Structures are given as structure tokens and as C-alpha cells.
Design a protein around this ligand. Structure first.
Ligand code: Q4F
Ligand code: Q4F
Lengths: 304, 304
């Protein structure tokens, strides 16, 4: 028992982190097979970042301008290309530590682990969620760009995020591994505002089920509700609307605890209306939304 | 910017996890050099756990009774010994993935990462703190015993904890890598109560400095206090007493922010007396105590 914000073991991703330098800019790259993926803004100077024309900037760059270092050894660059907001640097050596992998574009509400890196070296691992406004609330300093978000299913790593920037509000924006930004963000040093950061309702419900499984049951009430009644309350508290797709995904948790999804929705409704009254749930004084129903099942079952 | 509960990259420890089976009991082992370390209760049956005599139980066990598997391959056991509450199984092969390592017995208040494992396979990584009552609030299911807690300084892994049991209250107890339990706990299926779980004051202060660095400054007040005045308040709220040793360790954080340690203590005092008033600090509605002053500096500086 016990419930923690748990990240995937990061070893398989640590073996893929490299340092990429172009000119005076150094960031992180992801080395999978004979390709190194990194943010295309590695070709920019601070001057270029204000209004970059990446195609024009890339013309002045040759393979030898991209310095790729894995550990203390230099990789030879034999090709380069821009795919959306990422650069793909073809190297002459396949990464011997390449795990089984996939590139996935996640939906908002989905969680993943981030291996924060600096100079191609890992510094820490933490669990994130892609917010409904397509930002992530990470912990990234200068030099962290190119750090990646991922999920692991047994031996396969699904890379879902690559860090590119910090908005002026301190929240983070990035792309999938095909270089497409999550959200409307662009890789430019221009003020870009994030939309409403709503709460991931299905995740809060999953975490309430996790709390029941672990013994924290004080919040359970004698009430039920309907999807339409619950959503009227959810809209008011800037919670994402709950759909029957979300109810379906909470089914195994509902079955394990014997608490119907709509009864858990009614407990959530009263928690929103009355607050916690100075109480905690799983050692938290607020409703946690960065655990999916899959995360709860995984942690409560011990999937390795 | 941004502040997260961050764990160390777990790769160096993942390469050390093995599965140990003795009879019908399977748990995790830590393979460093030619020795596999695991909880001695691997020799117990559920019947034995009630009142085990480990010396007597160990007499009926030979090297061939300890099955050690690393990945899909079996390690040959050429010696065994009990050191306090851990068994050391000498194998004929040195672990090729043995990182540079040390065994450290941590003090309460110190944080570490746990690589939760099942059947010698890693399932997740999270950040913990050794509570002042010598328990940890982990996430451990049956089969997780033998999972270890650690810290990493550049390339050296300092193993500080090995998981042994869950108290009837759902909190966790274990040993250092020499087999000595943290706290008064014994490896026996008997009700053992934990003492008062006080708050790690120096850690809360460190996290308040982290909050100031990251822009959350609403809690800062126009007040100061003394160590004796603060401790009168800390004693009342079951917070650990703050010493000049703790003030000394907060010095770099005090210097970076320009906020004297005693002024931060006065902000903490008002937070304890008035509560958060429905507000948050670093996305938390309670005062976080599982970040040491070293963790805050490390994360706010990007140590890899
Ligand atoms: C995170 C990282 O490594 N970098 C590279 C430079 C400094 C920091 C951010 N990068 C500049 C930048 C500004 C605005 C937008 C984007 Cl995409 C990048
Ligand atoms: C965590 C783990 O792998 N185990 C082994 C068995 C089941 C679970 C706990 N172990 C029994 C036990 C009961 C009381 C105290 C201790 Cl030290 C162990």
C-alpha cells in the first residue's frame, strides 16, 4: 500500500541522451538508432530567437557544424534535416543502447515521465501530465531543452515529448518526436499566452479510487449524480467535462472498489462545493489530477 | 523554472536489480560486485514470519537453495551469510553493470529515491524522505521487498535503504545496506507502532526558499523571529526543532534570495498559525517537507 507520484524507471532513456552543440548553443539530443533528434532552435543565437527563419538559418549549417557527444565520445554527423521543429542528425553509428521504441503524440490529460538533462547528462526524473491547455508544469532550467517525456510498456519506450521552451508564465511547451508542438506554441522568443489550465476530471476520479484502495475514504458520501449534473459543477470549477469514454476507462477501478463511477462523481462534486475542510487525501490538501486511470491500476497492481 | 518532486535517474540501480527466491518466497536483491544483498526474511514462510529465529532457519539453507536470477539468466551462489537483517549471497560472477557505490546510513529528514521493483524488475521511481520516526511513506506492494533507496553524486550511487516491511498503518520500514533497521522496527509479523511523524522543519524552509526562487512569494511577511520563539511554535505544530546546524545549511538559499533564515522562519510561523487560506505554494496546498536544502540547490542549479 501507499500511493506516490511515480515515474517510469529512466535507464532506457538515459542510454539515449547525448549533447548537441551548434555554434555556441548546447542542448540535449535523443539518440535512437543512427539518428539524433533535438530542438531545431540549436541553430539559433539569442539574436535569432526573436524572429527566426529556420530554413534560412539551416542553409548556413553543414553536417560538421553539429557537434554530437555521447558520454566523452564524439559522433560523426553524416546528414541533417528539419522535420517540423526538430532536427534529425544522421550519425554514422547506431546507438548500441537503443531500446525498443515508438514515437507517440499524446492527448491532453495523459501523463508521462520526464528525464531532465543538461549537457546530455541526466539530472532527474519526474512525472508530468500534458495539461488540457497543451503546456506541462515541469522543472526545466536553461540547457534542459531536448530533454524528453516518455512512457514504458514492459520493454518498449514510447517517446511522447521533447522540451523546447518556457513560456513567460513559467509553464513549459514542447513537441512530439516528429517536431510538432503540443498546442498553438511556436519556437520563437515572443510572448505566448497559455489558455485556461482546467483540471483533468477523469484523473482526479482515478486518484479518488486510488485513495479508497489505500484506506483514505472520509470523502465518500451517501450521494450519487448524473453525467449532466456533474458536468454543470465541473464547468463551474474549471474541471474538464466528463464523458462516457472517461466513465468506461474508470470501469476497472469502479469494479475493484465496488463504487459506481457516478457515486465517485458525487463525492468529487461535494469536495468541489465544500472543500477539504483542512483534511488530506493521500497526503495531499488539493485534488490531484496527474494520475490517469491506467497509472492508478499500474501502481496499485505492480506492473514492471 | 518550475519545481518538481524529482528522483535521481534510476539507470545505475536498474542494472543491479535481481530476483532472489528461497523456497516459495521471491523478493528483490541488489547485485553489486559478486554479492547479492536481499532481506533475510527471503528464508521465511508466512508461518515463520510470526516469530522467526533467523539463525535457526538459515541452518536448513544451503547455497543451492538461494535462486538468483538477473534478467533471464541464473547466477551461481557460492556463499551466503547473514549480516543483521540482510543476507549477502556471494555469486561467482561480478555484476558487469556495478556502478561506483557506497553504503550510507542516512539521518531522519534526508531524502532519497526508491526504485520500486517486483521479481527483480523495476516498476517505478519516486522520491522519499526518511521520516523523523524512521519510517518512509512509500508505495510498495507484496514482492517489493529488497527494493532500494539511494542518492547519486555524479557517478557514485550511495545506497541508503532496503525495503523490508509495511507496518499495519501502511507506512514502510527497512534497513540500511548493512541490514540495520532504521528505527526500532524488527523483521517480524507483529504489530509495531510508529512514533509521532513530525514535520521536517529545515526541509519546509528549503521548499519555501525554492518557492521564492520560482516566483511564489505571497507568503512572505514583514516579520522576523528568533530560534527559541520559532521552536515554541514548531513544538506546538509537531514540527522538528530547528537548530543553528539547520540555519547553517539554509545559508546558500538565504544568500541567493536575500531572505534571512529567521525571516523565512517568521513566514513559516504565520503559515502555521493562519494556514494557507485556500492558497497554494508550488502547486501544493500543504507545506512540503520532502526536499532538503541540498535538493533545492541541486534542482534550482541543474546538477547532473
Ligand atoms: C532549454 C534550452 O536549452 N534553451 C535553449 C535556448 C536557451 C533555452 C531556451 N532557448 C531559447 C528559446 C527562446 C524562446 C523559445 C525557444 Cl523554442 C527557445
Ligand atoms: C515486501 C515483500 O516482498 N514481502 C515478503 C513477505 C511478503 C512481503 C512482506 N513479507 C512478509 C513480512 C511480514 C512482516 C515483516 C516482514 Cl520483515 C516481512
Amino acid at each position: 500500500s501507499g500511493f506516490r507520484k511515480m515515474a517510469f524507471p529512466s535507464g532506457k532513456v538515459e542510454g539515449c541522451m547525448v549533447q548537441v552543440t551548434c555554434g555556441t548553443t548546447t542542448l540535449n539530443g535523443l539518440w535512437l538508432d543512427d539518428v539524433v533528434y533535438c530542438p531545431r532552435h540549436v541553430i539559433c543565437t539569442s539574436e535569432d530567437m526573436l524572429n527566426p527563419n529556420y530554413e534560412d538559418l539551416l542553409i548556413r549549417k553543414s553536417n560538421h557544424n553539429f557537434l554530437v557527444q555521447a558520454g566523452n565520445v564524439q559522433l560523426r554527423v553524416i546528414g541533417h534535416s528539419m522535420q517540423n521543429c526538430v532536427l534529425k542528425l544522421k550519425v554514422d553509428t547506431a546507438n548500441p543502447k537503443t531500446p525498443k521504441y515508438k514515437f507517440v503524440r499524446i492527448q491532453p490529460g495523459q501523463t508521462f515521465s520526464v528525464l531532465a538533462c543538461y549537457n546530455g547528462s541526466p539530472s532527474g526524473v519526474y512525472q508530468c501530465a500534458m495539461r488540457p491547455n497543451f503546456t506541462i508544469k515541469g522543472s526545466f532550467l536553461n540547457g534542459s531543452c531536448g530533454s524528453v517525456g516518455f512512457n514504458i510498456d514492459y520493454d518498449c519506450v514510447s517517446f511522447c515529448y521533447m522540451h523546447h521552451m518556457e513560456l513567460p508564465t513559467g509553464v513549459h511547451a514542447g513537441t512530439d518526436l516528429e517536431g510538432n508542438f503540443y498546442g498553438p506554441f511556436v519556437d520563437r522568443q515572443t510572448a505566448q499566452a497559455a489558455g485556461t489550465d482546467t483540471t483533468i476530471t477523469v484523473n482526479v476520479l482515478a486518484w479518488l479510487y486510488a485513495a479508497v484502495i489505500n484506506g483514505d475514504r472520509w470523502f465518500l458520501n451517501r450521494f450519487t449524480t448524473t453525467l449532466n449534473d456533474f458536468n454543470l459543477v465541473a464547468m463551474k470549477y474549471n474541471y474538464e467535462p466528463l464523458t462516457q469514454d472517461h466513465v468506461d476507462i474508470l470501469g476497472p477501478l469502479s469494479a475493484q472498489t465496488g463504487i459506481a463511477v457516478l457515486d465517485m462523481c458525487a463525492s468529487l462534486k461535494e469536495l468541489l462545493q465544500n472543500g477539504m475542510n483542512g483534511r488530506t487525501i493521500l497526503g495531499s490538501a488539493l485534488l490531484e489530477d496527474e494520475f490517469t486511470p491506467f497509472d492508478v491500476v499500474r501502481q496499485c497492481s505492480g506492473v514492471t
